[PDB]
Amino acid sequence: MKSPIPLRDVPQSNIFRKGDVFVLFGELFGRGYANGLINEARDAGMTIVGITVGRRDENNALRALTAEELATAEANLGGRIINVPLMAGFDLDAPAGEPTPTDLLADMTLKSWQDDKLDWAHIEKCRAVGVQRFKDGVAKVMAELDGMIPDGANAFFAHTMAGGIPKVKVFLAIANRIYKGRGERFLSSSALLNSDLGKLILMNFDEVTANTFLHLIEGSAAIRARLEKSGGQVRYSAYGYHGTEILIDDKYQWQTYTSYTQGKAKMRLERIAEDAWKQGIKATVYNCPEIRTNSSDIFVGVELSLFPLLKALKKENGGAWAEAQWQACREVLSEGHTLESLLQKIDDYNASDVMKGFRNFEAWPMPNTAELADIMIGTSDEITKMHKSRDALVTDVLSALVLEGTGPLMFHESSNPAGPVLWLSHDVIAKQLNLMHRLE
Description:
Strand content: 5-15%
CATH topology: Rossmann fold
CATH architecture: 3-Layer(aba) Sandwich
Number of strands: 11
Keywords: Nucleotide-binding
Strand order of the largest sheet: 5-2-1-6-7-10-11
Keywords: Enoyl-acyl carrier protein reductase, FabMG, oxidoreductase
Structural class: alpha/beta
Number of helices: 15
Order of helices and strands: EHEEEHEHEHHHHEEEHEHHHHHHEH
Helix content: 40-55%
Assembly: monomeric
Radius of gyration: 22 Å
PDB class: oxidoreductase
Binding site for NADH: 27, 33, 88, 160, 162, 266, 291, 293, 295
Number of domains: 1
Distance between the termini: 39 Å
CATH superfamily: NAD(P)-binding Rossmann-like Domain
């Protein structure tokens, strides 16, 4: 798409009932977006079924879950898990007895990695092996799932797979410089992506973040056909990020965190959904807002996109509950600091020429720049220092709100989806939240 495709209206249909089956195509580890969606499915009475990515034995070989690991995972999910290890990516795949792509990275050093070259023929054979492995795994999982979904049922397949960074000792330092480096510590994301290491990373991103959605849709084709030929509806969802519209000068405007290295893979994901949609398959990528549930992570500055949600809460027929969110956000700031001054900082941030330059949709995802590092990391740090305690941030409150709103939006929109790719920006999130809390 040449521009964002917004979902503006709060969905109000639900076709799912007790006996319908919700399938989590991904494994839950810690809290994130998927929890809210799973909760919506459970509240609607759906049977929850999940996959596992498996674990690794003492020799780093992939294996299924033990009965105890399985019990723990099923307790976490609140549903049955099919114990067939669906590990995405090919970074640890190889023809029998041959080196993995990860093996080929073993000798990369801080000084050598940028110019080190890889054997792309071998890597290609490894990718082929990995793709076939994942396909056979999906076949087994679907063979077992087929009997758990009754004739006449509706099925909701929720894809959550993302990632693909290979294990290599040099990567932590590289990432630290790219994401957090200023001055001489600054490092262009292009330095990584132009290297063979970076090219491998991007290939694996395409496999894990995008192509797994295709493997899900194709692998479940027989099940889909059987359910559709009976009285049922089948849905596929995926989580996307492709920037978010937020209030700048009291107008909703698209922006993004830069540099989002998974961007090309997310656009491939989008195209997979669009193709499927053209084949009559109800697959939808939901492009969700920036969140930062762990402000100790490496992505310094992503949280800057969140703050205008406060204004959105007031704008979209906000009442007492919205005002209570403002109060909650005031309470975590230090003595002497106002919430208004924080929001002012964000106004100045989005008004800057440097940040305006990154509102380029066609160039997305763009490379970072030294100037970007300066203003983004500087602004993020300035706002962090406004707080009484760094374990209780305005961004914790707002991230929680986004998760809360996004669950029902996706769950209900999926009953009657408007299209294959939909943006959930601050406007519809605020509408949903204010609706949910209209009696509080």
